[PDB]
Coordinates of C-alpha atoms and ligand atoms in Angstrom, one line a residue:
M3 CA 0.0 0.0 0.0
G4 CA 2.5 2.7 -1.3
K5 CA 1.4 6.4 -1.4
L6 CA 0.9 6.5 -5.3
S7 CA -1.2 3.2 -5.3
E8 CA -3.2 4.6 -2.3
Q9 CA -3.8 8.0 -4.0
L10 CA -4.8 6.2 -7.3
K11 CA -7.3 4.1 -5.3
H12 CA -8.9 7.4 -4.0
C13 CA -8.9 8.5 -7.7
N14 CA -10.6 5.2 -8.8
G15 CA -13.2 5.7 -6.0
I16 CA -14.0 9.2 -7.3
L17 CA -14.2 7.8 -10.9
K18 CA -16.7 5.1 -9.7
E19 CA -18.8 7.8 -8.0
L20 CA -18.7 10.1 -11.1
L21 CA -20.1 7.1 -13.2
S22 CA -22.6 6.1 -10.4
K23 CA -26.5 6.4 -10.6
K24 CA -26.1 9.1 -7.8
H25 CA -24.8 11.7 -10.4
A26 CA -26.4 10.2 -13.7
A27 CA -28.8 13.2 -14.1
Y28 CA -25.8 15.6 -14.9
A29 CA -22.8 13.1 -15.5
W30 CA -24.4 11.3 -18.6
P31 CA -23.0 13.8 -21.3
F32 CA -19.5 12.9 -20.1
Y33 CA -19.9 9.0 -20.1
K34 CA -18.6 8.6 -23.7
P35 CA -16.5 10.7 -26.2
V36 CA -18.4 13.7 -27.8
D37 CA -19.8 12.3 -31.1
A38 CA -19.1 15.6 -33.0
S39 CA -20.6 14.3 -36.3
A40 CA -23.7 12.8 -34.7
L41 CA -24.4 16.1 -32.7
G42 CA -23.7 18.2 -35.9
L43 CA -20.7 19.9 -34.1
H44 CA -18.5 20.0 -37.3
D45 CA -16.1 22.6 -35.6
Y46 CA -15.6 20.5 -32.3
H47 CA -12.3 18.9 -33.3
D48 CA -10.9 22.3 -34.7
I49 CA -11.6 23.9 -31.3
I50 CA -10.9 20.9 -28.9
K51 CA -7.4 19.5 -29.7
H52 CA -7.5 16.9 -26.8
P53 CA -11.0 15.4 -26.3
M54 CA -11.5 13.6 -23.0
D55 CA -14.5 11.8 -21.3
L56 CA -15.1 9.4 -18.3
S57 CA -14.9 6.2 -20.5
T58 CA -11.4 7.3 -21.6
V59 CA -10.4 8.0 -18.0
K60 CA -11.8 4.6 -17.0
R61 CA -9.8 2.8 -19.8
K62 CA -6.6 4.6 -18.8
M63 CA -7.2 3.7 -15.0
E64 CA -7.9 0.0 -15.9
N65 CA -4.7 0.0 -18.1
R66 CA -2.6 1.5 -15.2
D67 CA -1.8 4.5 -17.6
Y68 CA -2.0 7.0 -14.7
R69 CA 1.2 7.0 -12.7
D70 CA -0.1 9.4 -10.0
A71 CA -3.3 11.3 -8.8
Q72 CA -2.1 14.5 -10.6
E73 CA -2.2 12.8 -14.0
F74 CA -5.7 11.4 -13.4
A75 CA -7.0 14.9 -12.2
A76 CA -5.5 16.6 -15.3
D77 CA -7.6 14.3 -17.6
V78 CA -10.8 14.9 -15.5
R79 CA -10.2 18.7 -15.6
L80 CA -9.3 18.6 -19.3
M81 CA -12.8 17.0 -19.9
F82 CA -14.5 19.9 -18.0
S83 CA -12.2 22.6 -19.6
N84 CA -13.1 21.3 -23.1
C85 CA -16.8 21.7 -22.2
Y86 CA -16.2 25.3 -20.9
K87 CA -14.1 26.1 -24.1
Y88 CA -16.6 24.8 -26.7
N89 CA -20.0 25.6 -25.2
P90 CA -21.7 29.0 -24.6
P91 CA -21.9 29.3 -20.7
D92 CA -25.8 29.2 -20.7
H93 CA -25.9 25.7 -22.4
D94 CA -27.4 22.9 -20.2
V95 CA -24.2 20.8 -20.7
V96 CA -22.1 23.6 -19.0
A97 CA -24.5 23.6 -15.9
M98 CA -24.1 19.8 -15.8
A99 CA -20.2 20.1 -16.1
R100 CA -20.2 22.7 -13.2
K101 CA -22.3 20.3 -11.0
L102 CA -20.1 17.2 -11.8
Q103 CA -16.9 19.2 -11.3
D104 CA -18.1 20.3 -7.9
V105 CA -18.6 16.6 -7.0
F106 CA -15.0 15.9 -8.4
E107 CA -13.2 18.9 -6.7
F108 CA -14.7 18.4 -3.2
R109 CA -13.9 14.6 -3.1
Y110 CA -10.4 15.1 -4.9
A111 CA -9.6 17.6 -2.0
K112 CA -10.1 14.7 0.5
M113 CA -7.0 12.9 -1.0
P114 CA -5.2 10.8 1.6
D115 CA -1.6 12.2 2.4
Ligands
LIG201 C1 -19.3 17.2 -23.4 N1 -20.5 17.5 -24.2 C2 -20.6 18.6 -24.9 O1 -19.8 19.5 -24.9 C3 -21.9 18.7 -25.6 C4 -22.1 19.8 -26.5 C5 -23.3 19.9 -27.2 C6 -23.6 21.0 -28.1 O2 -24.5 20.9 -28.9 N2 -22.8 22.1 -28.0 C7 -23.0 23.3 -28.9 C8 -22.1 24.4 -28.7 C9 -21.9 25.4 -29.8 O3 -23.2 25.7 -30.4 C10 -24.1 25.6 -29.3 C11 -23.6 24.5 -28.4 C12 -24.3 19.0 -26.9 C13 -24.0 17.9 -26.1 C14 -25.1 16.9 -25.8 O4 -24.5 15.6 -25.4 C15 -25.3 14.5 -25.7 C16 -26.0 17.3 -24.7 C17 -27.3 17.5 -25.0 C18 -28.2 18.0 -24.0 C19 -27.7 18.2 -22.7 C20 -26.4 17.9 -22.4 C21 -25.5 17.5 -23.4 N3 -22.8 17.8 -25.4

């Protein structure tokens, strides 16, 4: 039970919560990669250079891609940042991003030392 493993278990706990029924009402747009073509967002990949979503974070966690909590947090925040960059701030998806990021930031702050 080394510090990095321990901190990544906390990250995995957060990830499970973000994917849980508890938060499904505002988390669901972040479950899978933005389907730009399907949503008619033909400028999405010109504006967003590094797409990110919770399925990609889950795949990277399962594959032991993340070496520390900082790397995991950078992907979760990239996902939110992409949402805030692309969308007008009054879009429903931005309100949902804000709510899910509140869940993330408050639990991430409870990281074991
Ligand atoms: C991470 N997801 C997104 O950023 C996103 C963007 C847009 C969308 O159209 N963005 C266009 C900008 C520019 O032009 C106007 C806004 C739509 C969706 C939908 O996901 C299924 C959706 C539909 C309803 C509620 C929540 C999310 N997600």
